[PDB]
Motif scaffolding. Sequence first.
Motif, PDB file in Angstrom:
ATOM      1  N   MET A 135       0.313 -10.079  -2.155  1.00 51.83           N
ATOM      2  CA  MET A 135       0.223  -8.613  -2.357  1.00 51.83           C
ATOM      3  C   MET A 135       1.339  -7.836  -1.580  1.00 51.83           C
ATOM      4  N   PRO A 136       2.630  -8.081  -1.920  1.00 49.11           N
ATOM      5  CA  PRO A 136       3.693  -7.411  -1.122  1.00 49.11           C
ATOM      6  C   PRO A 136       3.696  -5.849  -1.138  1.00 49.11           C
ATOM      7  N   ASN A 137       3.429  -5.225  -2.295  1.00 50.19           N
ATOM      8  CA  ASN A 137       3.402  -3.752  -2.400  1.00 50.19           C
ATOM      9  C   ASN A 137       2.265  -3.130  -1.542  1.00 50.19           C
ATOM     10  N   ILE A 138       1.071  -3.719  -1.643  1.00 49.24           N
ATOM     11  CA  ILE A 138      -0.091  -3.270  -0.853  1.00 49.24           C
ATOM     12  C   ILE A 138       0.168  -3.474   0.633  1.00 49.24           C
ATOM     13  N   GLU A 139       0.769  -4.619   0.993  1.00 44.77           N
ATOM     14  CA  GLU A 139       1.054  -4.883   2.399  1.00 44.77           C
ATOM     15  C   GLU A 139       2.067  -3.928   2.985  1.00 44.77           C
ATOM     16  N   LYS A 140       2.998  -3.442   2.158  1.00 44.59           N
ATOM     17  CA  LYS A 140       3.950  -2.409   2.635  1.00 44.59           C
ATOM     18  C   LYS A 140       3.255  -1.043   2.823  1.00 44.59           C
ATOM     19  N   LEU A 141       2.400  -0.652   1.875  1.00 44.42           N
ATOM     20  CA  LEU A 141       1.657   0.621   2.060  1.00 44.42           C
ATOM     21  C   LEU A 141       0.885   0.537   3.370  1.00 44.42           C
ATOM     22  N   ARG A 142       0.260  -0.619   3.567  1.00 41.81           N
ATOM     23  CA  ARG A 142      -0.606  -0.828   4.721  1.00 41.81           C
ATOM     24  C   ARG A 142       0.134  -0.776   6.060  1.00 41.81           C
ATOM     25  N   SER A 143       1.220  -1.531   6.180  1.00 41.49           N
ATOM     26  CA  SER A 143       1.942  -1.591   7.459  1.00 41.49           C
ATOM     27  C   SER A 143       2.764  -0.324   7.717  1.00 41.49           C
ATOM     28  N   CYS A 144       3.291   0.315   6.675  1.00 45.54           N
ATOM     29  CA  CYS A 144       4.108   1.536   6.877  1.00 45.54           C
ATOM     30  C   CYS A 144       3.293   2.822   6.989  1.00 45.54           C
ATOM     31  N   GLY A 145       2.081   2.823   6.419  1.00 42.20           N
ATOM     32  CA  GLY A 145       1.249   4.033   6.402  1.00 42.20           C
ATOM     33  C   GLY A 145       0.203   3.986   7.509  1.00 42.20           C
ATOM     34  N   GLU A 273      -9.757 -18.993  -8.257  1.00 45.58           N
ATOM     35  CA  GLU A 273      -9.440 -18.083  -9.394  1.00 45.58           C
ATOM     36  C   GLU A 273      -9.164 -16.625  -8.934  1.00 45.58           C
ATOM     37  N   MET A 274      -9.392 -16.318  -7.651  1.00 48.32           N
ATOM     38  CA  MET A 274      -9.261 -14.916  -7.149  1.00 48.32           C
ATOM     39  C   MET A 274      -7.811 -14.539  -6.831  1.00 48.32           C
ATOM     40  N   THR A 275      -6.906 -15.522  -6.742  1.00 49.19           N
ATOM     41  CA  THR A 275      -5.521 -15.223  -6.350  1.00 49.19           C
ATOM     42  C   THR A 275      -4.840 -14.367  -7.420  1.00 49.19           C
ATOM     43  N   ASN A 276      -4.990 -14.787  -8.671  1.00 52.30           N
ATOM     44  CA  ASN A 276      -4.398 -14.100  -9.803  1.00 52.30           C
ATOM     45  C   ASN A 276      -4.795 -12.612  -9.956  1.00 52.30           C
ATOM     46  N   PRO A 277      -6.114 -12.273  -9.870  1.00 49.94           N
ATOM     47  CA  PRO A 277      -6.478 -10.834  -9.902  1.00 49.94           C
ATOM     48  C   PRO A 277      -5.824 -10.015  -8.785  1.00 49.94           C
ATOM     49  N   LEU A 278      -5.712 -10.584  -7.577  1.00 54.31           N
ATOM     50  CA  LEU A 278      -5.026  -9.929  -6.451  1.00 54.31           C
ATOM     51  C   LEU A 278      -3.550  -9.691  -6.724  1.00 54.31           C
ATOM     52  N   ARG A 279      -2.850 -10.708  -7.257  1.00 52.93           N
ATOM     53  CA  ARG A 279      -1.462 -10.561  -7.740  1.00 52.93           C
ATOM     54  C   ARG A 279      -1.329  -9.413  -8.759  1.00 52.93           C
ATOM     55  N   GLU A 280      -2.239  -9.360  -9.729  1.00 53.06           N
ATOM     56  CA  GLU A 280      -2.138  -8.366 -10.801  1.00 53.06           C
ATOM     57  C   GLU A 280      -2.380  -6.928 -10.286  1.00 53.06           C
ATOM     58  N   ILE A 281      -3.334  -6.761  -9.370  1.00 51.33           N
ATOM     59  CA  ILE A 281      -3.468  -5.442  -8.681  1.00 51.33           C
ATOM     60  C   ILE A 281      -2.188  -5.047  -7.949  1.00 51.33           C
ATOM     61  N   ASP A 282      -1.609  -5.970  -7.187  1.00 47.82           N
ATOM     62  CA  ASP A 282      -0.378  -5.649  -6.479  1.00 47.82           C
ATOM     63  C   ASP A 282       0.757  -5.203  -7.409  1.00 47.82           C
ATOM     64  N   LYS A 283       0.900  -5.924  -8.518  1.00 47.21           N
ATOM     65  CA  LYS A 283       1.885  -5.582  -9.559  1.00 47.21           C
ATOM     66  C   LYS A 283       1.684  -4.148 -10.088  1.00 47.21           C
ATOM     67  N   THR A 284       0.428  -3.738 -10.299  1.00 46.34           N
ATOM     68  CA  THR A 284       0.093  -2.362 -10.705  1.00 46.34           C
ATOM     69  C   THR A 284       0.517  -1.320  -9.672  1.00 46.34           C
ATOM     70  N   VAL A 285       0.271  -1.615  -8.382  1.00 43.35           N
ATOM     71  CA  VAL A 285       0.716  -0.751  -7.304  1.00 43.35           C
ATOM     72  C   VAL A 285       2.251  -0.635  -7.320  1.00 43.35           C
ATOM     73  N   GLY A 286       2.932  -1.770  -7.516  1.00 49.14           N
ATOM     74  CA  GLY A 286       4.398  -1.831  -7.665  1.00 49.14           C
ATOM     75  C   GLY A 286       4.935  -0.913  -8.756  1.00 49.14           C
ATOM     76  N   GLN A 287       4.274  -0.944  -9.916  1.00 48.47           N
ATOM     77  CA  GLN A 287       4.629  -0.083 -11.067  1.00 48.47           C
ATOM     78  C   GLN A 287       4.490   1.433 -10.758  1.00 48.47           C
TER      79      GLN A 287
END
Length: 805
Positions: A135-145, A273-287
């Motif tokens: 979750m790179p996009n979420i982790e950036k919101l988290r650490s920078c905010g 099976e939970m890794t993929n849904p987490l990836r897809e949420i992060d991608k949405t945040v990225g968009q």
Amino acid sequence: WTATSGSCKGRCFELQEVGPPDCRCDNLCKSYSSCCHDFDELCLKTARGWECTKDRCGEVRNEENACHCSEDCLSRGDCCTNYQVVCKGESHWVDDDCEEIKVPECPAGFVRPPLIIFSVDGFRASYMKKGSKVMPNIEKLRSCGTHAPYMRPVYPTKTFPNLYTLATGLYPESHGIVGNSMYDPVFDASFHLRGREKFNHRWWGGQPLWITATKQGVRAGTFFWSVSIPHERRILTILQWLSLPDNERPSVYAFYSEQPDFSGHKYGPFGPEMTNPLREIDKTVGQLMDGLKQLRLHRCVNVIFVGDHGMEDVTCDRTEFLSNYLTNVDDITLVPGTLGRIRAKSINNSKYDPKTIIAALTCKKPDQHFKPYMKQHLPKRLHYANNRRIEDIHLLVDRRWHVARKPLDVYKKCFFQGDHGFDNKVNSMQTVFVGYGPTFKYRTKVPPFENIELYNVMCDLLGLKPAPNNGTHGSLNHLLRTNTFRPTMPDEVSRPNYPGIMYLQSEFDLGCTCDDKVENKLEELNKRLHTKGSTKERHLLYGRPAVLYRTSYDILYHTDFESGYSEIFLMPLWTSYTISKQAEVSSIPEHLTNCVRPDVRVSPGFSQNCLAYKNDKQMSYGFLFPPYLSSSPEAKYDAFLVTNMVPMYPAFKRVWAYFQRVLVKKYASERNGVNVISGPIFDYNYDGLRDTEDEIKQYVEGSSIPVPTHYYSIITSCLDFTQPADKCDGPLSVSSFILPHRPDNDESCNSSEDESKWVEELMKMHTARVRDIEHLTGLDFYRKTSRSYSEILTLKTYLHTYESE
Ligand SMILES: *[C@@H]1O[C@H](CO)[C@@H](O[C@@H]2O[C@H](CO)[C@@H](O[C@@H]3O[C@H](CO[C@H]4O[C@H](CO)[C@@H](O)[C@H](O[C@H]5O[C@H](CO)[C@@H](O)[C@H](O)[C@@H]5O[C@H]5O[C@H](CO)[C@@H](O)[C@H](O)[C@@H]5O)[C@@H]4O)[C@@H](O)[C@H](O[C@H]4O[C@H](CO)[C@@H](O)[C@H](O)[C@@H]4O[C@H]4O[C@H](CO)[C@@H](O)[C@H](O)[C@@H]4O)[C@@H]3O)[C@H](O)[C@H]2NC(C)=O)[C@H](O)[C@H]1NC(C)=O
Ligand SMILES: NS(=O)(=O)c1ccc(C(=O)N2C[C@H]3CN(C(=O)c4cc(OCC5CCOCC5)nc(C5CC5)c4)C[C@@H]3C2)nc1
Ligand SMILES: [Ca+2]
Ligand SMILES: [Ca+2]
Ligand SMILES: [Cl-]
Ligand SMILES: [K+]
Ligand code: NA
Ligand SMILES: [Zn+2]
């Protein structure tokens, strides 16, 4: 009826709902069976997908595409979110270094930073650490905010009660959404997950954020998305709305994701099976973040990333069946699963008895994985009683378990491996909070907090006045760089009297006795100063509590404690004392076992009497300042004053005596001194608020001595435990409880054992915030400290949870 013959052309995702039987083009039309014939064709374009590619750059505008890569797209507000990256050499938002946002950097015509609330269903707090690699996009919101390590949901930790708490700042008992399934007996109507009835406005109480914004002239984006509208299209619609002209553009927006909840139910919280849904949420945040960057809004918008509840491992074989306890199982209706709610199947059956149902469900099996309660006996921290939609009988289910009526209910309805809804203190139910933007702080961690607080902060971010709610406004000021809310302390309503010696011993006829008649200007001038308040700085560390309602009360000083004594309720409202690390525990000497002494400062007419306790075969008495902790043999006589006495059931005296004789000293040793404030609570109508005298349902027999429903204690020390409680230079540390005053110990299945095996466990279950005690007593604590008021408001909302790390 809907005459679906109108057209959606130029109306796609229109901001105002047009009334039936005209056809709709808004983001909710699908859910009502009401979209215009051409809604899919015009408004839900899919051609060529969701991303620009090399050869699409500069293309001729094909209006059929889902998003565009043509030159005019920026000014149309409808590029694919990666357009500038692929075609114009730009970087993705996640690849850029973070840089402090000191002021909002907005395009001209923006009157305020917009707010975007990104909500994720079932997003358990430990996903932030455990899924961090994907979750790179979420982790950036988290650490920078600004982030908390977790956020506490409301009980029950279900979807609709928590989303509506996020919207309103209210407990479910006040907003009315008390579960995912409900019966309202006044309406004679039922609310369900599937179906039409849930759309009826009469279910939904309080005032949600979109209504608060509208009333105050702030435009809101429609918060809700029909399930079939894909995530990519929701993001594009938000971005398109952000390109509207100044007079039409909303200031607040919402995105909702059904994930990771949907998969967590199927695969458990940590299924591979939970890794993929987490990836897809992060991608949405990225968009979203790439899209805001394109619009030069990435240093202008405030973004909140927030969940509704977590997710626990729960399977079909961990189900308790009510048919294994009850014979009359067909005379009941159960709302089942991770909580239980029970009522009579028919209101015409007068042989239904709740009393016998409770007893048949109480401590029946050694491993029993649920505990029955009358709703008014549930831990007050749950705030789960004051609503006609909450059934009298409630089952609190252990984490990892379900309750069902009969085995047939499970196999004729294993599928699931995850669920949620349990006690909101449970670690697996905790969820997430991140705030990123010009109004939030930079690279800041804040302590865990409750989701009831967020409505006020969302109002602050939008310059709105919050409707009345259950947050404590100012307790989350530490999340914000600016827009803080400057609260002031409530005004004291009643001032105390300070009585001196006014009564002779023989004026009292209370039927009390004490073995105390034993007879020096050294120790006589000494006792005088102690009754005028010479040791008051020792025992009252944060000022006296303020009384916020109209009443008659006295301050009483003693060597070892100070109290505010109510002439109306005939007992203290509060009793304050400090116990140092060095303090010694002593016994109640034999000759003083039944000693109760008249208080010569307080009239016979405003005193309790011992006769009522003798005649009341059910009721005994205890003391608020404990005689075990007296500083000296002579000081000990003060603890036996009639003005320090309170009514207690013998079953409850077991709890109270263990707390006072063993636990206070233990906490003082561990925390380097404690200050204790104890007192009665009267909540006969279970509304979480102080009763007036005309609400009291029970008195000590043949007297006007009212019986408390609960007893509280607030236990304060120095956060830096190298300093003693009574000489603390900095922040404070608190734990508190609100113990139910019950005539039995049926709640604790191990109560025939020694108190050392069950009392502390009961106390932990009934842990509380200072703020909960304020509501229940009409008192305001911590009035005189050296700390800022916002810091004190945060302290008053703290809950000590007793869950591991
Ligand atoms: C958490 O925060 C909330 C919000 O601040 C706190 O709740 C408030 O507490 C107040 C005191 O309990 C309460 O004030 C009362 O309002 C009555 C009018 O209420 C209506 O108007 C408001 C404003 O628009 C609205 O929000 C209300 O909505 C409730 O009811 C509808 C259904 O009708 C629901 O959709 C909605 O979910 C909400 O339900 C919740 O609250 C009600 C109580 O109102 C509960 O019964 C429900 O279970 C549920 O929890 C209303 O539409 C007003 O009539 C009251 O005045 C009476 O009492 C005073 C005493 O001062 C007396 O002087 C008056 O004469 C009057 O008495 C008369 O009525 C009596 C009963 O019929 C009768 O016995 C007497 O003889 C008299 O005839 C009162 O002022 C306020 O409404 C709520 N607000 C909300 C949103 O719940 C809550 O306390 C906080 N919790 C904690 C722990 O701190
Ligand atoms: N198995 S389960 O867990 O029960 C379960 C069962 C069903 C589903 C499900 O698919 N649906 C479809 C979803 C669409 N929907 C919303 O659009 C929505 C967003 C929102 O957002 C409110 C904002 C949230 C952020 O803070 C501000 C308010 N509020 C509301 C309500 C409170 C007014 C609704 C939530 C609906 C649940 N998910 C889990
Ligand atoms: Ca949910
Ligand atoms: Ca009350
Ligand atoms: Cl429910
Ligand atoms: K008695
Ligand atoms: Na018991
Ligand atoms: Zn769910």
